Design a protein around this motif. Structure first.
Motif, PDB file in Angstrom:
ATOM      1  N   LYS A  60       0.870  -1.198   0.000  1.00 52.26           N
ATOM      2  CA  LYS A  60       0.000   0.000   0.000  1.00 52.26           C
ATOM      3  C   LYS A  60       0.896   1.234   0.000  1.00 52.26           C
ATOM      4  N   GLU A  63       1.832   1.377  -3.699  1.00 51.98           N
ATOM      5  CA  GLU A  63       0.659   1.655  -4.578  1.00 51.98           C
ATOM      6  C   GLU A  63       0.064   3.011  -4.192  1.00 51.98           C
ATOM      7  N   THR A  64       0.434   3.525  -3.047  1.00 52.26           N
ATOM      8  CA  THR A  64      -0.105   4.845  -2.603  1.00 52.26           C
ATOM      9  C   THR A  64       0.839   5.971  -3.039  1.00 52.26           C
ATOM     10  N   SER A 150      -7.931   2.951   7.124  1.00 52.74           N
ATOM     11  CA  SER A 150      -8.304   2.825   5.687  1.00 52.74           C
ATOM     12  C   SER A 150      -9.717   2.252   5.594  1.00 52.74           C
ATOM     13  N   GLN A 170      -0.928   3.839   4.716  1.00 59.74           N
ATOM     14  CA  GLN A 170      -2.228   3.114   4.535  1.00 59.74           C
ATOM     15  C   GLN A 170      -3.397   4.099   4.618  1.00 59.74           C
ATOM     16  N   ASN A 172      -6.259   6.654   3.634  1.00 63.12           N
ATOM     17  CA  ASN A 172      -7.037   6.646   2.355  1.00 63.12           C
ATOM     18  C   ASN A 172      -7.151   8.067   1.794  1.00 63.12           C
ATOM     19  N   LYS A 174      -8.367   9.035  -0.587  1.00 60.49           N
ATOM     20  CA  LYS A 174      -9.449   8.968  -1.622  1.00 60.49           C
ATOM     21  C   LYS A 174     -10.738   9.575  -1.066  1.00 60.49           C
TER      22      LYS A 174
END
Length: 249
Positions: A60, A63-64, A150, A170, A172, A174
């Motif tokens: 993460k 990928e983050t 998350s 981790q 989020n 988003k």
């Protein structure tokens, strides 16, 4: 008049998400050689879990933010999977009849304490990063609940005394609206994110975590460097018009 260091300007509205942590109670009880076999499986297989935990946070982080930060958490797993720190844990449980919870603390007790004996904010700050890998290890042997930040589903503000890379790796980004922490660090990690993400945030809140609760209605101004807690509709309505007039500026 909460004066902080102000990371970036920007007015945002959202509910308060307070991150509280339950104190961990370690078992300092001496077990019998009849339950030692259980400690090895609870720890050994519990190694398949903790190892599987950071691993999930490891990807993460890549990928983050990108494989760029993944190399840092990669070595953090080697320390946990260190075959040397493992033979010491095992022996202790068998030689001093210590619980995987207590024995595991013994090693984490000298790794963090020993780094504090160094006079370098580099290896010292690593002490906090190493101890952090320990608290997680414990939550695994005790099967205690894990803080999963998350899991947000509604837009809210983030309030916490401080967040370590793992938590930010981790987090989020988003559904988050902003970051508020009492870190009086002219260069606190939570700030480096606010800087690269240019989003608005604050870090020198100091004791706001002791003045707000979760779900509370917060309003970040990030203009006059101040946070308003449940302000009157007269102030909100007055700022709602001016605030948005700034978006056009």
């Amino acid at each position: 008049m909460i004066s902080g260091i102000l990371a970036s300007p920007g007015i945002a509205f959202g509910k308060a998400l307070l991150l509280k942590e339950d104190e961990i109670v370690i078992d300092r009880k001496k077990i019998s050689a009849d339950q030692v076999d259980q400690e090895v499986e609870r720890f050994l297989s519990g190694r398949a879990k903790a190892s599987a935990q950071l691993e999930t946070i490891k990807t993460k982080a890549g990928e983050t933010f990108g494989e760029e930060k993944e190399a840092i958490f990669e070595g953090h797993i080697m320390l946990l999977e260190d075959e040397e720190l493992e033979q010491e844990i095992i022996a202790l449980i068998k030689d001093k009849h210590m619980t995987a919870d207590a024995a595991a603390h013994e090693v984490i007790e000298g790794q963090a304490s020993a780094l504090e004996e160094l006079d370098d904010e580099y290896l010292k700050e690593r002490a906090a990063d190493v101890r952090d890998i320990g608290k997680r290890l414990l939550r695994n042997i005790l099967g205690l609940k894990i803080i999963d930040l998350s899991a947000i589903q509604d837009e809210v503000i983030l309030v916490a005394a401080d967040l370590t890379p793992s938590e930010t790796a981790q987090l989020n980004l988003k559904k988050v609206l902003g970051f508020i922490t009492d870190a009086g660090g002219r260069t606190s990690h939570t700030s480096i994110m606010a800087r690269s993400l240019e989003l608005p945030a604050i870090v020198g809140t100091g004791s706001v975590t002791s003045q707000v609760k979760n779900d509370d209605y917060l309003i970040l101004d990030a203009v006059n460097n101040q946070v308003y807690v449940n302000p009157t509709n007269e102030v909100i309505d007055k700022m709602r018009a001016v605030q948005e007039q700034v978006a056009s500026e």
